[PDB]
Symmetry: C3
Subunit: 223 residues, 3 copies
């Protein structure tokens, strides 16, 4: 039906397999700290799996009028990210034993990032969609700022090493989302929805399963 | 108006009385641990009370097209369960001093269970509704698994005893929900909505007020 | 377009400036406890900023049929309060080192207060709107009760002093909301929407930025 269906189907399959792999791999783990990381990390692709399935079956898709056309908007992505992005930030924060204040700042700014992105995606006045994109981007920039300038002296080498790798993976991949949104169907519409869907699938799988494989294979998750 | 109104009214009344009873019973409690259990346990029927009232007044009801008919779907149940089921799991987890990793696993899987159940309840393609039911059921099975195989050596007798009772009550009652959904109006439609509503009221009151009476009368909630 | 636009624009500007001020003021803070208070306190007007902008641009506004008319209902307020009121209660609770049980009681009752207020705001049967208002008010009264009768012996003077001031500010300002709602467009409609919007803007800015200035200038936030 929809040309982007193949990418949604592949996304569903990859998130599903990733979830199952992490689920199996986490069996037997008794270390409290490691359990936290496995729980957070397995839940991420499990949620993504449900939302990709939602998009594939057509439930997480809605039509938004703007620019004089009926624009297909997959709102299920925000329902996904609303829960998965904060969880991913939690993995990074727990890894460096961040204090509660910083965790709340990250989670709250993340909520603002996704919430304003959702508002922008459903906004009927074309020009306003970009106002929301700008605010969401400012929130993302705040998050990236905190990750880099927001624990070193008393920090295990493996912890510092894995955190630096996951932080770099996060900054690169997350930074791409606003660009894809901006040039894709939710924004300027210069890149067709099918290609946009492919881009998000690669980004999502990398930011979730890729990110997860790196974290769960590290000894940093253990006390 | 709607034949199932009597069960919604009785459900509203029972949840309301249960809330008031727990509220009174919890007065004077100074023990920190006991306070946690009273807060969690009183909030559960208070939330259920609001959603049952929502259904009674008709606000938590919507019409979903599928199978060639306008099907009355009480979505308010998911708004209820989304918050009450995780809270109930929290009572069980705190009772056994479960570690954060396991708590997150339970809460996250519970969110998936209710979220996919909601998607299934509102899905317009009949066959797909059952795909969502299957995923939600898999999440429930994971939860039941964790409760039984997911703390013994260093565990007070009263704690182990009450937990085992509440765990058995939980497995039996919770396991009935997917069956009721499957044969009821949201699924195969072989059992009429009025009878389905009665079933859920008995299950809800038992899983909330019944469950609550057992927990709050035990000495396990005290340090 | 809408006469109340000026108050929404001023509200947007004030919440935005307040957010920026708190953001700057919180720079350099290394004290863990102080970080918690700055995070919570800065997030509050940041969220309010987004929802006021939502109302200004028209996204957070919907039409609800009741009383034989199309009533303009700004639902964005509840999306705001759903997150900001619990955060404000968290500031007060952390300030007095409240135990988890009491925190959950406050947060849960707050959720009920806002959730039932939202249901009332969107209810099509006029008389029922007031039933929801009554339940929401009962939840607010419970919260006010807990704040006054729910830690003294072992409590720093500055902490007790600032808490008492913020508690008084909270009881006075919060108590006004149900009155405004009752006499405003969501209720009896005796006070026009434009005036109602002005009232909420003054209350919101005072309960958020005013409240925030008092808290963040106190030494109580430091360990
Ligand atoms: C599993 C998914 C991940 C890690 C998704 C990350 C999403 C973002 C960083 C999204 C950010 C956006 C903006 C900064 C601007 C507005 C549009 C968004 C929501 C695509
Ligand atoms: C107070 C209510 C309780 C304890 C409700 C429990 C609800 C469930 C365990 C629901 C589970 C469902 C499935 C496993 C399959 C799909 C349909 C549901 C949501 C009814
Ligand atoms: C930043 C906003 C604040 C501090 C808002 C406070 C909101 C309330 C205390 C609202 C309470 C209401 C009731 C008690 C009755 C029903 C209507 C409401 C939601 C306006």
């Amino acid at each position: 039906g929809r040309p982007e269906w193949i990418w949604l189907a592949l996304g569903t399959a990859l998130m599903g397999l990733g979830t199952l792999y992490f689920l199996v791999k986490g069996m037997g783990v008794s270390d409290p700290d490691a359990k936290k990381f496995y729980a957070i990390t397995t839940l991420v692709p499990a949620i993504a799996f449900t939302m990709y399935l939602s998009m594939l079956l057509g439930y997480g898709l809605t039509m938004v009028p703007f620019g004089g056309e009926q624009n297909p908007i997959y709102w299920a992505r925000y329902a996904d990210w609303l829960f998965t992005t904060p969880l991913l930030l939690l993995d990074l924060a727990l890894l460096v034993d961040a204090d509660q204040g910083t965790i709340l700042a990250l989670v709250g700014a993340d909520g603002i990032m996704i919430g304003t992105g959702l508002v922008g995606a459903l906004t009927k006045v074309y020009s306003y969609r970009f106002v929301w994109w700008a605010i969401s981007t400012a929130a993302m920039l705040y998050i990236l700022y905190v990750l880099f300038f927001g624990k070193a002296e008393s920090m295990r080498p493996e912890v510092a090493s894995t955190f630096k790798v996951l932080r770099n993976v996060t900054v690169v991949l997350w930074s791409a989302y606003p660009v894809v949104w901006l040039i894709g169907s939710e924004g300027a519409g210069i890149v067709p929805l099918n290609i946009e869907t492919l881009l998000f699938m690669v980004l999502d799988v990398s930011a979730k399963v890729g990110f997860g494989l790196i974290l769960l294979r590290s000894r940093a998750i253990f006390g």
